[PDB]
């Protein structure tokens, strides 16, 4: 017998495609969810700032009543 290195009856194929998934969101959906979380942060920001101004006015009234 002979003992070279042949391929055994043929081998499987190997791909040659530029395999790209291009996944992720679109323009509109990513854009809208970013602006939506932005507006959520704005609303909570507005609420905290106006309640904070209430308390800071109370601090002003403390210094007024303390002064003379």
């Amino acid at each position: 017998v002979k003992q070279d290195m042949p391929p055994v009856g043929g081998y499987g194929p190997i791909d040659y495609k530029r395999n790209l998934p291009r996944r992720g969101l679109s323009g509109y959906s990513m854009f809208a969810v970013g602006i939506g979380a932005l507006l959520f942060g704005y609303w909570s920001m507005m609420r905290w700032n106006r309640e904070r101004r209430r308390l800071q006015i109370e601090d002003f009234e403390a210094r007024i009543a303390l002064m003379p």
Binding site: Q3, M5, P7, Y11, G12, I14
Partner: protein, 53 residues
């Protein structure tokens, strides 16, 4: 672009392993006489090429 240098050099180290097993040199594998290939490839190589592919 520091890193894909290293990545594809890992791939090139695998192919240097194939050159080493075939000839014995790291890089300067002469191995090709005028008039054919000297000292043909050992047994257990083609499936390794397949997995690398």
């Amino acid at each position: 672009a520091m890193t894909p240098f290293f990545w594809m050099f890992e791939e090139r180290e695998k192919m240097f392993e194939f050159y080493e097993r075939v000839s014995g040199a790291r890089m300067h594998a002469a191995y090709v006489r005028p008039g054919g290939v000297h000292q043909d490839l050992p047994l257990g190589l083609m499936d390794d090429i397949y997995e690398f592919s």
